[PDB]
Symmetry: D2
Subunit: 216 residues, 4 copies
């Protein structure tokens, strides 16, 4: 089911502080290498008046190099697929709620994304587009009550110096009964490699591999 | 702002990947702080979550404001206001909601978007084990030129005990109005009648504003 | 008896804020059935205090609250044995204060033994630069969990320049003898400093409290 | 010196119950590893899970590469102090402080630790914790001082994990060069203990890296 080279198609519908928008994207990736790429276009609600870096982490942990020591919860969910839900709680009070329903049609992954964020102050880095990039992170995934959850508090590097923190609470739910893994980690690094002035066209990348921390 | 007003709404939203839509109609009396409405699920029925979590999303115009406290909401009409709110429950369930309220004569028109995630399948919300929200006293304060509302309240559970939630509301009028100071608004919202699957719901709220202890 | 219309207070708070230790003792009068009390406290070690004094005022009993007969007083029924409480005050900028109080009764006098630790208060924040004026009046909300009473409130301190500095409390009250547990109720507050020095080595503290059952 | 010794004294209270612990141990700062033996000296036997104090018992014990600025080794012989607030998912919050100084080859800790609002049905008060899982801490500069953040968990007895967020602030007594946004991998273990945990042998292994990176 898992081919070494797969395609991505998505459609995000959402709103931030009451401003609705829609974005579509297309891209490629290699699940066994943990790297993926896509290009997204704003289709409704443009130009986006908020920092584009708050949607980048919503735009599939299938793309993660899993060793043979760690159980891959995501590659085992196909061809049925899985869905995840996530809340991102920023330190200044802004919270973004996101959901994604992932299915497989041959070599292409089809996403169904909903993204809503509220309580972003007008003087903050999000509404003032003063974010540069997400810093590298290390997500921690653990199984709780039959589903696997992923938690990490990471940060955005701000234009001028300093960091803007965000606390992620993700829950992954497969559509099919699969074998659940142990407490392990997944390192991330997401970066925007190309965009326009109004971020109407964005090229996003992600690199991820799973590890188990420092050995005992 | 007339003493007897009507309410019309339409909430569209989703919970843990479930989209649904609800419409409602109701009446209220803004200068007395009381309102009532009737809601019908129109999409996504039957609802698989506790109906208690949306009742607080269904306009602080319905609050008895004394004359010593500045009425932020009655000063926004006929232009109106909008509010944004995140509700963070103690077990990890988080709901983000927005409502854009306008006035068409004597009727308030709501346009609500409500999305909640990370609700565990063993929690009171997924098993519909909530009874009612208990009375609350919301705290309203102005921050960075906008009005904010904060309260940590709870839901009474079916077997007994409480389910806590932290509210952070931000109210933004569409026109510049005079800002109030740090005051309170007491609440008491109850579902007075329902239709099994909560496909039909009668919701009531009573609210008064005060400024605390002397 | 047991509780007279006029009760006395003796206490000793030992603690530390950002690693700086201090100790203070106090005495005062109080009318438990009216919900009013008065105090005089003297810093005895670690002066002058380099933090806003409004950070200790809410730690310095809920016996002093005019409870109605319609609501069960969890605290007045715990004497002459007494009770103890724990609290975690979480400020919006990240400063957290943990406090404990063991209250006992010796005739007409209440004996407190308080330990107070606060950490992660930024050097640029209202607490360490003493830009607080007063606590706003609150309204606490008390509920029973595991046979003990809990008190939670989202409150704020007014800043010198204008605006408020928020704090979220989670207090737990535990009586030393089995008592009747109450229903979900509220207690409204108003704490005020009536007099102080320059370095707040001498402070006049007042409290007013009533219990109610919300809006009818 | 590449070979360091340790001596500490933690005084604290958990849920209003006071206790005191002392410890001594070894270390190699340039390898990120350390070992110790601590004895509870007041308030025993402890009625709480011992695994909540182990991480309070100095980032100098972390192997730092040369592309990353070592904020901690760069503060001696004056030293630094740190504060932390670890807040567990069920509501228990612990505030801890440590002031470290150096007397030759020995590190002196002076630790004060208060934890409150720990429920009676919890993994901490029923001593149902087994071990901390390995972690990856995130350290970033804020207002000229160093900060440390981590969202980690404890492995429980019947199964599952117990979550806690650490928010640490390290501030040296000396003007030091501040690093970039980096990480520190951890794995803290107790290799030997008593029945009432009056004697504890603790190990920690820590290395710093720069995120995800034959020859």
């Amino acid at each position: 089911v898992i081919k070494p080279d797969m395609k991505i198609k998505l459609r995000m519908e959402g709103a931030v502080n009451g401003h609705p928008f829609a974005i579509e994207g297309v891209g490629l990736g290699k699940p066994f290498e943990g790297k993926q790429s896509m290009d997204l276009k704003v289709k409704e609600g443009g130009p986006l008046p908020f920092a584009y870096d708050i949607l980048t982490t919503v735009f599939n942990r299938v793309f993660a190099k899993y060793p043979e020591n760690i159980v891959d919860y995501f590659k085992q969910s196909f061809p049925e697929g899985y869905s995840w839900e996530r809340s991102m709680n920023y330190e200044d009070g802004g919270i973004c709620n996101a959901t994604n329903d992932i299915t497989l049609d041959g070599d292409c992954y089809i996403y169904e994304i909903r993204f809503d964020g509220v309580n972003f102050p007008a003087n903050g880095p999000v509404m003032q587009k003063r974010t540069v990039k997400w810093e590298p992170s290390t997500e921690k995934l653990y199984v709780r009550d039959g589903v696997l959850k992923g938690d990490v508090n990471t940060a955005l590097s701000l234009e001028g110096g300093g960091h803007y923190r965000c606390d992620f609470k993700t829950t992954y739910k497969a559509k099919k009964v699969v074998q659940l893994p142990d407490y392990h980690f997944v390192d991330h690094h997401i970066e925007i490699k190309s965009h326009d002035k109004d971020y109407s066209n964005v090229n996003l990348h992600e690199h991820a591999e799973a590890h188990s921390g420092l050995p005992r």
